[PDB]
Amino acid sequence: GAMAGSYKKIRSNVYVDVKPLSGYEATTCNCKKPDDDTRKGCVDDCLNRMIFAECSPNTCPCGEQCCNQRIQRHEWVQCLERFRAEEKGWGIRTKEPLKAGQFIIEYLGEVVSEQEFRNRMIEQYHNHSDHYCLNLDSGMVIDSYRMGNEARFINHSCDPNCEMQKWSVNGVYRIGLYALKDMPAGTELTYDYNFHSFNVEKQQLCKCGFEKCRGIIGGKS
Ligand SMILES: NC(=S)c1cccc(-c2cn(C3CCN(S(=O)(=O)C(F)(F)F)CC3)c3cc(CNC(=O)C4CNC4)ccc23)c1
Ligand SMILES: C[S@@+](CC[C@H](N)C(=O)[O-])C[C@H]1O[C@@H](n2cnc3c(N)ncnc32)[C@H](O)[C@@H]1O
Ligand SMILES: [Zn+2]
Numbered sequence: 001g002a003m004a005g006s007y008k009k010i011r012s013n014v015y016v017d018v019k020p021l022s023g024y025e026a027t028t029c030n031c032k033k034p035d036d037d038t039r040k041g042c043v044d045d046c047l048n049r050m051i052f053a054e055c056s057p058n059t060c061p062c063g064e065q066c067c068n069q070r071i072q073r074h075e076w077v078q079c080l081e082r083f084r085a086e087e088k089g090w091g092i093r094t095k096e097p098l099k100a101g102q103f104i105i106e107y108l109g110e111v112v113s114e115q116e117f118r119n120r121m122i123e124q125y126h127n128h129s130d131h132y133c134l135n136l137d138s139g140m141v142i143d144s145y146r147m148g149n150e151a152r153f154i155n156h157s158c159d160p161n162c163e164m165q166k167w168s169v170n171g172v173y174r175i176g177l178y179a180l181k182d183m184p185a186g187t188e189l190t191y192d193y194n195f196h197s198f199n200v201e202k203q204q205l206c207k208c209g210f211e212k213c214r215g216i217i218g219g220k221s
């Protein structure tokens with residue numbers, strides 16, 4: 001059998017019975033390429049960035065200086081580490097400081113319909129002690145119970161320091177983890193499962209440690 005905590009490490013999402021087409025392809029924005037090519041273009045006022053669409057490289061006026069292609073250019077931070085998080089199994093911490101708003105990592109897994117996921121829950125997952133299912137869009141989820149990347153080890157917090165964002169990238173929706181606030185070296189990354197995770201209808205104590213803790217992962221106040 002498989003070893004405890006085993007999972008298949010994948011490089012990008014695996015489309016099972018659905019593909020999360022966004023219906024949109026970004027075209028040329030109104031940005032101007034900086035003449036100093038060490039300076040980023042397509043910053044906060046990029047019209048594609050403002051609709052959570054990453055630029056398309058054949059049409060972006062900033063070319064290699066575009067900083068609105070973070071997911072497709074795989075611009076993950078390289079300082080993440082899996083560690084033993086007290087009373088929360090494995091967690092993920094950043095070894096170096098992060099800043100509010102920063103892109104951290106793409107969340108990967110198997111893209112499945114809610115129908116397929118419910119089938120997998122009945123047949124396999126119902127008695128697991130750890131769960132791995134992120135929301136995505138209407139009728140579909142990212143299932144990282146079997147396949148994914150190290151983002152699957154990020155724990156829930158009732159006072160999170162990161163969030164998920166859904167972006168249109170090359171015609172498909174993809175999910176990135178972004179910092180909500182500055183974080184010093186050593187910080188465990190967390191996000192709010194109530195906002196970003198699929199309701200797997202499982203009942204688990206929250207050990208996030210905050211005074212505002214809801215007591216249950218994904219629970220109400
Ligand atoms: N996905 C992962 S990894 C994961 C891992 C562990 C728990 C949950 C998780 C659990 N729940 C509830 C199940 C019933 N419990 S309960 O304690 O049994 C009792 F008794 F009923 F209160 C209360 C908590 C959730 C509720 C929501 C609500 N969000 C949504 O539905 C989306 C937001 N847009 C709509 C989101 C995630 C969860 C998800
Ligand atoms: C997406 S996995 C996170 C990685 C997991 N800790 C592990 O060891 O592989 C979600 C599971 O981690 C545990 N977990 C996540 N956040 C937690 C928290 N705040 N308190 C206690 N357990 C938590 C729960 O068992 C949950 O089903
Ligand atoms: Zn732009």
Ligand SMILES: [Zn+2]
Binds near residue numbers: 042055063067068
């Ligand atoms: Zn651009």
Ligand SMILES: [Zn+2]
Binds near residue numbers: 159210212213
């Ligand atoms: Zn909590």
